[PDB]
Structure formats: C-alpha cells, structure tokens
Homo-oligomer: A and B are copies of this chain.
Amino acid sequence: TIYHAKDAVQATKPDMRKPRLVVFVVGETARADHVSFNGYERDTFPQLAKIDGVTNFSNVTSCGTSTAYSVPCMFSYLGADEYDVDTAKYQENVLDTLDRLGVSILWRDNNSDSKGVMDKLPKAQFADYKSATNNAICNTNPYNECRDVGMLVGLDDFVAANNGKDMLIMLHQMGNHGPAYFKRYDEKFAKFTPVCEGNELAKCEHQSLINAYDNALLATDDFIAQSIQWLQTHSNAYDVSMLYVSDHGESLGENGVYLHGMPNAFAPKEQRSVPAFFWTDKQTGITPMATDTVLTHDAITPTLLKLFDVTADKVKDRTAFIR
C-alpha cells in the first residue's frame, strides 16, 4: 500500500479523556435543493428540524456523480483534484489511518459495498445489511426491501463490545436510489401523492416523479433523526457526533436528463450538489464551521481526523466541516 499519513498521531487517547463515538451516514442520490433547510418549498426534513445542534451545510459539491467514483474519493487523502478512481484502492485512506491509531471501524452497507474503502481492514468490520440475514427490517413493505433503519439494530451491542474505545460507524444508505424511488420508503412516509411507479421516468408525469423522490427524502430524515437519537443514548459515556453527506445528486428531468453518472465535464449541476448535516452533543466541545462554508467531499477526511483528535500533515490546512 502507498501511504499518505504515516505521520498521523492521535493527540489524546480514550484512557485519559472521554471516548468518542461517531456515526457517518454515507447518503445516496440526495440533492441539496430538495432539502427544506436549503430553500425547498416542501418540508422534506421535519424530524431533523426539531433537533437542536444540527448544522445544515448549504454549499457542498460531490467529488463525482456516481457511487463508484465518489465513495472512494470521500475517504481519500488526495482530494478531488488529484484523486484517481482506478488506483484509489491501493492508497492508504482515512479509515486505514484511524484503524491504525486504535479507532474501532465498522461499516454497515444497505447500498452495495464500500467501493474498495474497507478492503485493507478485516472482513469482520464490514457487514452486508441488504439482506434479511443481517437486517431485521425487510418485511415492512411489499417489495421485501431492507430498510436503512435496520442498520441501527444492535449497535448498542457493538458499543458494548468496544467499551471505552473510540468508535467510527459508517452506515451506507439505500437512500434515494432510483429509478424506483417509490420502493425506497415505507407507507408511513407516503406524504406526497400520487407517485410515479415503473421505470420509464420520462414517461411518468413529472410531479408524481418528484413526489416519490420527496417521500424517499422523508424516510432519510427519519433515518438520520433515529441515528442521532441512538447516539444520544450514549452521550453520558461518549462524546457523540453524527456526519451525513450524500455521495452525489440526481437529475430529475432537467434538459430531459434523468438519474446520475454523467462525466464531471458534462454533468449538470444537479448531479453534484449534495446535502450535508453535522450534529454533536453539547458536551463534545466540537464546533461546526459556518453553514455557508464552501465545502466539497474533500472536507470529509480532515473532519473525521479532527473528530478523533488526529493530526495528519497532508490535510493539515484542508477545510473541514468543523473548526
């Protein structure tokens, strides 16, 4: 492997200060401009609106327009300008660094896989939550589709197994994956109706397409809120924080363009404008950056290091989501 933060050190250890517990939700296909906090005309995040300590970031751009391109870049040391997708898996990434320094890494996936990010770490630290073998919440809908909230089940046991250590938990969402947006949420989030069903998105009435997309966002609002609520059950023993960033956006009929995956040189802005949220308990001493900070996926790696009191010279002066 080729290293980029061999110099990295953790300034303080959980035996002298409170251990730190962080949930990083890797979102899927969510657009910044369909978030209520960013000006959208519908209340797509009603549950997050009721939680104090949530920062919504209004100017975040993804590294690319697809899961395969963006997810390795989100955890990279290279930054979007120097990032290479084909050789990313051979580079030391930020999870490699945190694991080397003693942070317990867990990756639960209801999307696909880590796109190479977890490859160097033991297989037991990656868990497939797309099937009923691990996910207890797949029988809540007629498609028998496993839900993101299922990734929260049993995390109390993971904390008990790593009692006293620093912990970083990645939850890779099914989220707003298309084209069958109507399958991405249970009946309790079917607020906006009617919805488009079927696959020929250009043939669907446009408003019904948007309705299905917005209902999926409601289910993600719920998932992030329940992630924070879980972390709050551990706030006494742990300094708890939550980071959410979507891997890319989505086209929804603009210029007749749908879905994502366009090359960056010709991708419409809708495919790279993503939401990001950060929450932390009042005890942690962590302070968010201003909500209007110009941010990209390049901010994720220095954010994760900073959350765990880690200094790496490569990202020393890189903009983060927190101060």
Mark A residues whose CB is within 8 Å of B.
32-33, 38-39, 55-56, 58-59, 108, 123-124, 127, 133-134, 136, 153-154, 157-158, 160-161, 273, 290-294, 319
Contacts and interface: CB of A to CB of B under 8 A. Distances in A.
A33 to B, nearest CB: 7
Contacts of A290: 133-134, 136, 153-154
B157 A124 contact: no
Contact of A292 (B38, B127, B294, B319): B127
B58 A123 contact: yes
Tallying the copies of this chain within the complex gives 2
B38 A123 contact: yes
Given A124-B58, A127-B58, A294 B39 contact: no
A134 B33 contact: no
29 contacts: A32-B124, A33-B123, A38-B123, A38-B124, A55-B133, A56-B133, A58-B123, A58-B124, A58-B127, A59-B124, A108-B292, A124-B273, A124-B292, A127-B291, A127-B292, A133-B290, A133-B291, A134-B290, A134-B291, A134-B292, A136-B290, A153-B290, A154-B290, A157-B293, A157-B294, A157-B319, A158-B294, A160-B294, A161-B294
Contacts of A38: 123-124
A211 to B, nearest CB: 22
Given A56-B133, A127-B291, A127-B292, 17 more contacts: A32-B124, A39-B123, A58-B127, A108-B292, A124-B273, A124-B292, A134-B290, A134-B292, A153-B290, A154-B290, A154-B292, A154-B293, A157-B293, A157-B294, A157-B319, A158-B294, A161-B294
A92 to B, nearest CB: 21
Contacts of A273: 124
A115 to B, nearest CB: 16
A112 B305 CA distance: 37
A61 to B, nearest CB: 10
A124 B58 CA distance: 6
Nearest to A108: B292
A292 B38 CA distance: 38
The 5 A-B pairs at the shortest CB distance, nearest first, are namely: A161-B294, A127-B292, A59-B124, A39-B123, A133-B291
Contacts of A292: 108, 124, 127, 134, 154
A55 B108 CA distance: 18
A127 B157 CA distance: 39
Contacts of A133: 55-56, 290-291
Contacts of A32: 124
A323 to B, nearest CB: 10
Q: Counting chain B CB atoms within 10 Å of each CB, which of A56, A136, A292 scores highest? A: A292
Nearest to A37: B133
A319 B157 CA distance: 9
Contacts of A108: 292
A153 B291 CA distance: 12
Contacts of A319: 157
Contacts of A293: 154, 157
A124 B56 CA distance: 12
